[PDB]
Swiss-Prot record:
This is Endolysin. Induction: Expressed late in the viral replication. It comes from Enterobacteria phage T4. Changing residue 132 to M/F: 2-fold decrease in enzymatic activity. Changing residue 11 to N: Loss of 84% of enzymatic activity. Endolysin with lysozyme activity that degrades host peptidoglycans and participates with the holin and spanin proteins in the sequential events which lead to the programmed host cell lysis releasing the mature viral particles. Once the holin has permeabilized the host cell membrane, the endolysin can reach the periplasm and break down the peptidoglycan layer. Keywords: Antimicrobial, Bacteriolytic enzyme, Cytolysis, Glycosidase, Host cell lysis by virus, Host cytoplasm, Hydrolase, Viral release from host cell. CDD domains: T4-like_lys.
Amino acid sequence: MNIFEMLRIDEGLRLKIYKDTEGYYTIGIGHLLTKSPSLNAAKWELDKAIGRNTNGVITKDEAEKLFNQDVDAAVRGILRNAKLKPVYDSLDAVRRAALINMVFQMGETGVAGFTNSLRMLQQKRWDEAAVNLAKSRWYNQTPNRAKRVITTFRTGTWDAYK
């Protein structure tokens, strides 16, 4: 499996404008459109993103390519972070997947907030990291997802996704 596969399941797919847990206008595969309440703004963001007028409706194709960008964007931000870089450097191919999800789901900052989890990670202390990642709002809010993520960090296997 891979990050793509991984996040596809976590975020689902929707070719039409929808609302994320916070009341944010989103599309495709976790694609944040806007933070404005104006569904008119959310729409424009789209057409800007797609590069065509979409009347708020997209193709698999479009979602998937936006999906690719998002990730890479994600990826980039990590490499650019001082806190993350070293952790990401340290991981294996599966554990990174698991970090990237985190950054994707919450942004750079919120991931750099897990200070002690970041530490334990870097020290390869799996179990411990796990025990600690679970003591967050994150978990308490999207436990569903947080347990897959955590289990990944924990095992280094894709089991939580099989």
